[PDB]
Amino acid sequence: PSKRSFIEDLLFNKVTLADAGFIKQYGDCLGDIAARDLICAQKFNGLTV
Amino acid sequence: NTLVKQLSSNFGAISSVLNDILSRLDPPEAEVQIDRLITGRLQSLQTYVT
Amino acid sequence: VGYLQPRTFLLKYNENGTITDAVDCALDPLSETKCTLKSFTVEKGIYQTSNFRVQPTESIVRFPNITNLCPFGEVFNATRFASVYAWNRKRISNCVADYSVLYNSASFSTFKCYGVSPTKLNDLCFTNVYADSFVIRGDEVRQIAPGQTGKIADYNYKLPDDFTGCVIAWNSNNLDSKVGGNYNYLYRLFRKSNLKPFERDISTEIYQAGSTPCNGVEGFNCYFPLQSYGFQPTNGVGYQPYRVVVLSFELLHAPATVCGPKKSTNLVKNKCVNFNFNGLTGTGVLTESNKKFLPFQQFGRDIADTTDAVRDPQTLEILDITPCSFGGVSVITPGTNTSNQVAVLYQ
Amino acid sequence: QCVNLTTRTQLPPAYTNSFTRGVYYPDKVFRSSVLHSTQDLFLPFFSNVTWFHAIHVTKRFDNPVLPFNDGVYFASTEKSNIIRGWIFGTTLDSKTQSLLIVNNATNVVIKVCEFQFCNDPFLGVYYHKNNKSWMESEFRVYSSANNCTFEYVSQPFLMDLEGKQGNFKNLREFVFKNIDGYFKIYSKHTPINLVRDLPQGFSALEPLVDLPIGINITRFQTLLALHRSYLTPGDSSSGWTAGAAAYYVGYLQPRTFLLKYNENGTITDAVDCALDPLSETKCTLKSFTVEKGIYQTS
Amino acid sequence: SVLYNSASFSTFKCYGVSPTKLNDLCFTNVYADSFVIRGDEVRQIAPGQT
C-alpha cells in the first residue's frame, strides 16, 4: 500500500510511536478509559499533539 | 507525562484540588490558596516551554 | 429590550478618549483570535483558538437519607456541665445539622471556626463528629485556641495545631453562680509537664514542688493539684462562669453521616451537570463504573489527585466522573483585510 | 483474686526477622493501577522482631510487660484461641488510667478505667473428662476498676475453645497507634499451614477501629488463656497446662514507602525507600525495575 | 507559671514570637512599661493603631 522500499519498511517497524493517528474522539475514552490511557489523560488537561 | 503528574503539587496550599478548596472556603479565603496554585502551575508550563 | 450576560470585551479608545469600537471575544473563533492578538486586524493563516467547551445544563445534589435533627438540646442546654480537668466528649451521628433552630433561644459571645468558612456549613457533610464540653472562668476563654499558653492550655485542655472544627462559648452566670459560692467546678494547677493534644488527666496525687518527697501527705512544698473556682453572682465579668463546647470533625475524605440541611434531587447521567456529593462540588458527566470500593471508602482519585469516582450515598453504586471539555480547534482566515469568511478545523 | 503462676521454666529471649510485613492502608481513598509514595509510621523491612511462646511440652507461659514506643506491630500464630487481648497504660496500678481490650468467651469488651491490674493476668479454660467440653471458668485480670470514661461491649457470640492438635492454622496481624487522643487499630487475618517462624509474603492491613480514649500509653501487656483438666494436678498456682501459641512484636518508625496498587485497588507490593541505596534508586525512578547503570543516590 | 495561681489576664498577646516557645528562649534588652487606662482603650495598645 505504502510505496516504500524493503529497507524503509524494515526501518519503520523498529521505532514505535507513542500514538498512531491524530483522531482520538471524546466518546472513545469516556469513563474508565480516561486516566488509564496516558494520551486521554494528557488531552483532558489541554495538552495536544 | 511529567506535566500531567505535576498537577498533584500543593505549592504550599491546603490541597492541590480546586474543587476541594472551593467547597469549605469562601471567595476571600479561597483566593489566596487559588493564587498559590496558579503561580505554581504557570511556573510548570514555563519550565516545559524553556 | 435585551438582557445582559457576563462577557469579555476588547474596547478601543481613540486619541480623544472615546470608545469607538469593540470586539465580543466569545462570539466567534475569529473574534477569539482577534481578542488574543489584541488587534482588530488578522493576517492570513491558521490559528489555534481554544479547546471545545460544553456548558452544564442541570445541577444535582446527593446527600444521604437522614431524618432526625442533631441533639442541640442536650449539648447546648444541659443542666450540668463538667469540670475542665475531667472534660466531656460525646459522639454525634445520623442527624441533620440545622443550627438555625438555635437562633431563637441561644446567644453566643464566642463562635470561631478553623479549617472551614462559616458560610459553607449549610452545604457540607461532616465525618467523625465529637462534642467536648466544660466550664471555665471568663478570662480563660481566649486560651481555647491552637497554640496557646496558660494553665488551661497546659494542664487541662489542649487543641492540636492542625484543628478542623468550631469553638463556641457563652456566659452562664445565671446557671452556675450561687450566692454563697459555687465550688463544684475544679481545675488543675500543678503538673510536671504539659498535656498532649486531646489528652485527659484525672489523677489526684500530691504534687512535689521541690525535693524531700511527700509520701502523699500534703505538707510544705507538697500540694493538692486540683483547685476550685469560686463562682458568685457578684463577680466581675472576668471571673464569671462560661460554658464552652468544642466541635471536632473531618471534611470530604471519608463517608459522612451528619450532613447539614440541603434538599436532594434526582440522579441524572450522561450529561454535563453541576454536582454536589456529600458536600463535594464539581462539574462533569456521570457514568456507570466497574470499580469496587471497599466498605470504608467513599471517593476515588487518579494520578493527578482529582476525584474521578464516587459512591452514591443513596443507591450505593459506584459512578465515574468525566470532564466535558475536550478537543482541539483551529481557524483558517484569508486575512481580515480580504474577507470575514473563515473555516474551522476540529482536530 | 490474683494468683502468681509458678512452675514456669525461664529461657533467654528469641528473635526473628520480618519479611516485608506490617503494611497497612494509609488513607481511605480508592486508587488503582498506580505507584503512590507516602510518609508515615511503618514497620521497617527485614527488621528484628521479638518472639514469644506458649508451649507446654517447659511451660514457658510468656507474658512480659513490653514498651509501646511509637506504635506496635503484633503478629499471632494460633490454632486454639490462646491470645485473648491486651492492656495498655503507663503504670497499670489504679493511680492512672488504663485501656483493656479483652475477648471473653462471649463478648468483646473495651474499657478505659483506673484498674488495679494483677501482676500476672490471665484467663482460664477448664476441660471436663466425663462430658467432653471446654468452658471458660476464670477471669483474673484486675482487682478493681473505678472511674470509667469509655466503655464498649460487642454483641454476644459463642467461641470454639477446643484444644487442637495440628500445626498452626491462623495468622492474625494487628497494628496499634496512638495519635492526638485516638487509639487506631488496623488488622488482617490469613490462613497458613506452618509450625514455626513468622512466614513470608505480603498482605496489607485494613482500618478496623479508631477509639477516642485520650490517655498516655507507654507500656502494654498481652492477655493469654490457660487449660486445666484432670491431667493438671495441683493447686491454683501449679495445676495448669499451657496450649501452644506464638506471638511476635515489632516497633514502628517514620519512613517513606512506595506502595503499589493493582487494577482492583489492593496494595500488592511496597518498597522501603530508606533500606538500601538500591531501594533509594527504585524510589527515585518510581519503579520496581532498575536498568543497568550507575546512579547518584544522596 | 508562678503567676498562674494568683493572676488572671483578660489580654495577653505576643508579637514576633510564639507563646509556646517562651520556655526555650533567652531574652536580650528586656524592659517593662506600666500604665493604667480605661477599658475601651485597651485595643489601641497594638502596632498601627489610631
Ligand SMILES: *[C@@H]1O[C@H](CO)[C@@H](O[C@@H]2O[C@H](CO)[C@@H](O)[C@H](O)[C@H]2NC(C)=O)[C@H](O)[C@H]1NC(C)=O
Ligand atoms: C506520659 O507518661 C510517661 C511515663 O509516665 C511520661 O514520661 C516520664 O516523665 C517523667 C517526668 O515527668 C520522667 O521522669 C520519666 O523518665 C518519663 N518516662 C518515660 C518512659 O518517658 C510522660 O511525661 C507522659 N507524658 C505526658 C504528656 O504527660
Ligand SMILES: *[C@@H]1O[C@H](CO)[C@@H](O[C@@H]2O[C@H](CO)[C@@H](O)[C@H](O)[C@H]2NC(C)=O)[C@H](O)[C@H]1NC(C)=O
Ligand atoms: C505476686 O507477687 C507480687 C510481687 O511481685 C506481689 O505483689 C507484692 O505485694 C506485697 C503485699 O501486697 C507488696 O508489699 C509488694 O510491694 C508487691 N510487689 C509488687 C512488685 O507489686 C503479689 O501480692 C503476689 N500475688 C499474690 C500473692 O497473690
Ligand SMILES: *[C@@H]1O[C@H](CO)[C@@H](O[C@@H]2O[C@H](CO)[C@@H](O)[C@H](O)[C@H]2NC(C)=O)[C@H](O)[C@H]1NC(C)=O
Ligand atoms: C536482634 O536483636 C537482638 C537484641 O539486641 C540481638 O541480640 C544481641 O546480639 C549481639 C550480637 O550477636 C549479642 O552480643 C547480644 O548479647 C545479643 N543480645 C541479646 C539480648 O541476646 C540480635 O543479634 C539481633 N539480630 C538477630 C539476627 O537476632
Ligand SMILES: *[C@@H]1O[C@H](CO)[C@@H](O[C@@H]2O[C@H](CO)[C@@H](O)[C@H](O)[C@H]2NC(C)=O)[C@H](O)[C@H]1NC(C)=O
Ligand atoms: C463477657 O463480658 C460481658 C460484658 O462484661 C458479660 O456480659 C455481662 O454479664 C453480666 C453478668 O450476667 C450482665 O449483668 C451484663 O448485663 C452483661 N453485659 C452485656 C451482656 O452487655 C459476659 O457475661 C462475659 N462473658 C463471660 C463468659 O464471662
Ligand SMILES: *[C@@H]1O[C@H](CO)[C@@H](O[C@@H]2O[C@H](CO)[C@@H](O)[C@H](O)[C@H]2NC(C)=O)[C@H](O)[C@H]1NC(C)=O
Ligand atoms: C475518681 O474516683 C474517686 C474515688 O471515688 C472520686 O473521688 C471521690 O468521688 C466521690 C463521688 O462524688 C466523692 O463523694 C468523694 O468525696 C471523692 N473523693 C474521695 C476521696 O472519695 C473522683 O471523683 C473520681 N474522679 C472522676 C473524674 O470521676
Ligand SMILES: *[C@@H]1O[C@H](CO)[C@@H](O)[C@H](O)[C@H]1NC(C)=O
Ligand atoms: C478628537 O478631538 C479633535 C479636537 O477637538 C477633533 O478635531 C477630532 O475630530 C476628534 N476625534 C478624533 C477621532 O480625532
Ligand SMILES: *[C@@H]1O[C@H](CO)[C@@H](O)[C@H](O)[C@H]1NC(C)=O
Ligand atoms: C432549655 O431547657 C429549659 C428547661 O426547661 C427550657 O425552658 C428552655 O426553653 C430550653 N431551651 C432551648 C430548648 O433552647
Ligand SMILES: *[C@@H]1O[C@H](CO)[C@@H](O)[C@H](O)[C@H]1NC(C)=O
Ligand atoms: C435511601 O433512599 C433511597 C431512595 O429513596 C433508597 O433506595 C435507599 O434504600 C435508602 N436508604 C439508604 C441507606 O440508602
Ligand SMILES: *[C@@H]1O[C@H](CO)[C@@H](O)[C@H](O)[C@H]1NC(C)=O
Ligand atoms: C457437662 O456439660 C455441661 C455443659 O457443657 C456442664 O455445665 C456440666 O458441668 C458438665 N458436667 C459436669 C459433671 O461437669
Ligand SMILES: *[C@@H]1O[C@H](CO)[C@@H](O)[C@H](O)[C@H]1NC(C)=O
Ligand atoms: C481483580 O478482580 C478480578 C475480578 O474480580 C479478578 O478476576 C482478579 O483475579 C483480581 N485480581 C487481579 C490481580 O486482577
Ligand SMILES: *[C@@H]1O[C@H](CO)[C@@H](O)[C@H](O)[C@H]1NC(C)=O
Ligand atoms: C500581691 O500583693 C498582696 C499584698 O499583700 C498579696 O496579698 C498578694 O498575695 C500578692 N499576690 C501575688 C504575690 O501574686
